[PDB]
Structures are given as C-alpha cells and as structure tokens.
C-alpha cells in the first residue's frame, strides 16, 4: 500500500478468482492507546479495535473510509482505494478505449503549445480525474480541470460520455523540430476504484487545424471561383505555417490546391473544402461548406 | 539614383576632392509640357525649366526638395537625399561607433525574443531613423519607434546622445539552440544626408540579465548569510533557465556561488552580487548592492 494524498492510500489487489488479499495496517493518529475502536463506511458496527488495525483487503467492501473512535469521540480517519489487477494485468474499466484501442486522444489546432486531451467513461458516476506531465529534460505542461462534453461518442451501439482537458506547454518552440514527446499521465478514480493511464505524443502528430473561413464564391466565364482564408486559430505567420487544402463537391475524390482560391464547375450544390499542414501530413480539418450559387 | 519612398530619392555621390557629380533627371508629375519651371528649397529663384529637369548633383546644396511650377501653380515635388562615398567607402557620420568600433549595440534581459538596440548620434538634430529585419529562412522581428534616452554615453571627452529601439522576435524558441542570427538594418537620415547600418547577432550572445532582487542579510555564528532571488524579468522556469552569481565586497576579486544564498564575512560595508547565465557566458548584470548591517 502507498499514499496518494494525505489519509488516502492505494491498495493493489489481485482479482484472480481465489487469490489471497493484502494485509494492511491502519494506525490511528492519536496519542491514546486504550479503548480504540474502528468503523467503516462500507459496514455496520465496530469492525476492529486497537490503535493499529490489521485487516485483509480483497474486495471493494473492504475499502472506503476507516474511522477511529475512543470513548465516543472520532479521533482520525483513513481512506483506502483499490487498484485492481487481474490475470497479471492492471484493470482498465473506468475508461473505454477509442476505436484504435487507445484511451487518451489529444488534439491541437496550431503549434501554440496548447492542446486538448479527451477520454471516454463507461459510467459517468462519482468520478475524479487528474492529468499532469508524467516527468518533470521534460516538456512541462500545465493542465486545466477536466470537463464533461456535450458530445457523446458512439462506439459499437454505445453512446459514451466524453471528458476533455485543455493544457499548455509552459515554454514552447513552434518552429524547431520536436525531438522529445510530451508525456502525460491520467489518474482516474471511481468511488473507491483507482486506475491510471498514460500517453506520449508529438504536437506535430496531433495537429488538426480549424476549417477554412469565409468561403466565398464568385462567377466567371460555367466556371466558378471558390476562395477562403486561413482559420484565425492557425499559427502565424502563414508564410511559414503554410497549409494545403482539398476541395470536393457534394484522420482526414477531392483534389489538392495550395492557394486560398481555386476554379471549379459546380452550378448547383454545396462546395466543401478542408485544410491540412502543407509540409507535414497531420490530420485534416472538418469540412467548411457553403452553397454554390451565384447571380 | 533609386527611390526610397514616393517622391524621395537617394543619390549616391562621390566626395573625393574633385570627382564628377551624378547627372539626375527629375520629371514633373503633370500632363502639361509648356512653361514649366523648377525651384529648390536650397536656392533662390527659377533654377530650371522643362517638364524634365536635368542637373548635376555633387554637394548638399544640390539636394533637398525640387518643386514644379507652371503659370504660378505648383504641380509636383521631388526630394533628393545624398548617400556620401569618400575614398571608396560609404560615410559613417550620423552615428558614432561604440568603444569597439561597432555602431549598433543590442541587449536582451531574457530569452523572450524581446531585445533593445541602441546607437549614438554625433548631432541630435533633424534625425529620422528606421530599423527592421534585413531579410524576410529569416527570423522576422517587429520593432517599435526609436526614442531618445536620458543616458548620455561618454567617450573620449565626449557626451553622446543615445537612441534606442525595442523589438520582439515574432515567433520565438527560447529553449532550442539558435542556428541563424537575427539580422537588422538601420536607415539613418540627417536633413538630406542618407546612411544605413547593419548588425547580426544571436540572442544568447547579447543576454544581460537584470540584477538579483531583494538582497536580504541575516546574522549567524562573525558570519553573515546573504540571500537574493532571480530577477522577475528573467526567463522561466528557473530550473531550466538557471543563473550563476558573483559575490564581492566593497561585459561583466569576487567568488562564484550557484545558489541564491551564500555565507560571507563583512561586518561593516556594502555587499554586492551580480548574475549571469549559468551554462553560457553572456554578459553579467549590474551589481545589486545593500548595506551589510545586522542586529
Ligand atoms: C500507476 O499505478 C501504479 C500501480 O498502482 C503505480 O505504481 C505504484 O506507485 C507507488 C508510488 O510511486 C509505488 O509505491 C512505493 O513503493 C516503494 C516500495 O515499497 C516497498 O519496500 C518497503 C521497504 O521498507 C516496504 O515497507 C513497502 O511495503 C508496503 O507496500 C507493500 C506492497 O508494495 C505492502 O505489502 C506492505 O505492507 C507495505 O504497505 C514496499 O514493500 C516505497 O518505498 C515507496 O515509498 C517511499 O517513498 C514514497 C515517495 O517518496 C513516499 O511517499 C513513501 O512515504 C515512502 O517514503 C512507495 O510507497 C508502488 O510500488 C507502485 N506500484 C508498483 C506495482 O510498482 C504508479 O505509480 C502509477 N503511476 C502514476 C503516474 O500515477
Ligand atoms: C544601404 O545603402 C546602399 C547604398 O546606398 C543601398 O544600395 C542601394 O540600394 C538600391 C535599392 O535596392 C539599389 O537600387 C537599384 O538599382 C538597380 C540597378 O540600377 C541600374 O540599372 C538600370 C537599368 O535600366 C538603370 O536604369 C539604373 O540607372 C539609375 O541608377 C544609376 C546609378 O545606379 C543612375 O546613374 C541612372 O541615371 C539611373 O538613375 C541603374 O544603373 C535598379 O534596377 C533597381 O530598381 C528597380 O527595382 C526596384 C526594386 O524593385 C524598384 O523600386 C525600381 O523602381 C526599379 O524597378 C534599384 O533602383 C542601389 O543600386 C544600391 N546601391 C548599390 C551601390 O548597390 C542599400 O540598398 C542600402 N541597404 C539598406 C538595407 O537600406
Ligand atoms: Cl495521443
Ligand atoms: Cl550587437
């Protein structure tokens, strides 16, 4: 057993059918040594005595908050969390991996050093999350607090609630090549179940620019000119942070164009265009569409 | 002759004792072709006629503003500047080089990409300055407007007025090694004299941190502890952007200490400390001093 925060301990337990639980000792933060009794918020009545309580922890009813008591007064408390281990493998039950069997998916709309990471939960109940830089050589990152998103991700015939966190690399270098990845670790808590997850990535690999903006269209000799602009969130200056665009007619039959304008032949329909980093093949934006109509 | 801005041209002239001036043609921005006369703000009365004025420019009285005139109305103007060339060498007369025979000295208190460049003038009269990135591969820089500083630099038995400009690298990388220098060009104008100057530097080489702050002192078994803190302007985090300090008793007999505190034996006097980048030998701060007295 090890301490996670003050008066909160993680007990690693093996859930193979009949495996012996862990014997843990809880000592009461008190000077007294006589008439000390213990209680648990998972059980009813005195379940132990003495200043040091020894118990066998194997199932979740053994976890929770253990409280001290002497002469009718409560003296101290301690909280136990279980980190499950089955078939020799840490449990991955709080989060549901994405389609590619990964648990944390992160995204950046530019090279600012800002990015958002997301994960899916199997049950949105009594959750506590904490994400931070795994190592601090390392690219230090500052992360906000996780938030529940209105967007439910559908997998199988599943609708999962999604949590996302936005972070910022403390000191950034948008231009130079990244030679060390950003390393993060997520701690997940559900009631008294403890899990943790990790990921490592380069910003250049998780790039996903916003869609082109102000997609206008003008008529010419039919032939039609479609033009757009770089999204406002994209890194500046555009001369260095240059993008490419795919234009089609209705990760990432649409043809490539490098300028912010291109000729085409629509005459009735919606014309859509996406963007991508010009010199690196990261992810492409969502489609920006506008009706194809002129006078 | 070449155009600097609209209706302002630079004429390169040789000032070797008796060298032939340059023949320049000034054409009047008018449809008319008859009864066109010319005047100069350096001379009195009509000094030319015709829609195209041909003149020999060798001295500064030949420069200035030439004005068109027809039937009593002024039609157009053109302004001439001279870029002096003597003994086969461009003139360096508006600015006075620093002690090391350079003209532009720049300084940065951190790796933010912000820095200030300064130069000295021989005569603070009718001056116009403009500084910009020489090439725009290149580290683009945005510069404010030059300003006269109260600090007069004394050289020889000289007291020179100093001009300084503050600029910012548009996109910075404080951590990675600089492999290309920042290249700037200063244009200097004094009345109708034109000159320009250039410099190239790495930020790491022009680093000059601010002095240590809150230099406190406490007594111990005599022996005295002096402690300080990193300046607020220094790059963060200090764990990466680490400094060293020299401590002495009263570019950069004072001994080195790496922590922000050190023991010493003063008992009466001022104790001074300076700072320097820990892993690179740039310039050292100005001394931060405080009286050495305790109770
Ligand atoms: C993701 O999840 C994994 C799995 O849960 C995490 O791995 C665990 O991390 C913790 C914290 O880093 C590790 O804890 C440490 O364990 C060492 C070694 O302990 C041993 O030797 C001691 C010798 O005296 C002995 O007393 C210890 O006994 C206790 O534990 C055993 C079971 O391990 C139990 O049977 C006994 O009854 C005791 O209860 C033990 O045998 C320990 O030395 C560490 O503690 C010192 O240092 C820390 C940090 O300075 C300090 O806080 C302590 O107070 C103490 O001073 C610490 O407890 C644990 O071993 C990891 N588990 C595994 C399997 O490796 C992982 O960290 C998570 N990652 C992220 C990013 O969240
Ligand atoms: C620092 O200071 C130095 C010295 O002053 C600067 O160097 C000068 O920079 C300017 C601007 O870049 C240079 O000007 C250019 O000159 C070329 C070549 O001109 C020649 O060939 C022409 C062929 O038709 C000919 O007509 C020209 O004739 C004129 O000039 C000669 C004297 O040179 C004169 O005798 C004639 O009577 C004419 O008046 C000339 O022989 C020219 O082609 C350039 O112009 C075109 O392109 C520019 C930019 O697109 C455009 O603005 C023009 O309208 C034109 O379309 C331009 O005029 C000059 O040559 C440099 N001097 C030297 C010695 O190299 C330097 O730039 C400064 N640096 C900084 C950072 O400030
Ligand atoms: Cl990822
Ligand atoms: Cl310099």
Residue numbers in the entry:
A (entry chain A), B (entry chain A): 23 to 158, 161 to 245, 247 to 275, 287 to 288, 292 to 334
Tell me, in the authors' exact words, what the paper reports.
Here, we present the use of the GlycoDelete (GD) HEK cell line for protein crystallization, which produces homogeneous mature-like trisaccharide glycan stubs. The GD cell line is derived from the HEK293S MGAT1−/− cell line and has been transformed with Golgi-resident EndoT (an endo-β-N-acetyl­glucosaminidase similar to EndoH). This enzyme processes the Man5GlcNAc2 glycans, allowing the NG to be further processed by native Golgi-resident enzymes to generate mature-like glycans consisting of one GlcNac (which can be fucosylated), one galactose (Gal) and one sialic acid (Neu5Ac). The glycan stubs do not need further enzymatic processing, and we show that for heavily glycosylated fragments of human colony-stimulating factor 1 receptor (CSF-1R), murine IL-12B and human Down syndrome cell-adhesion molecule (DSCAM) the NG modifications facilitate the production of diffraction-quality crystals.
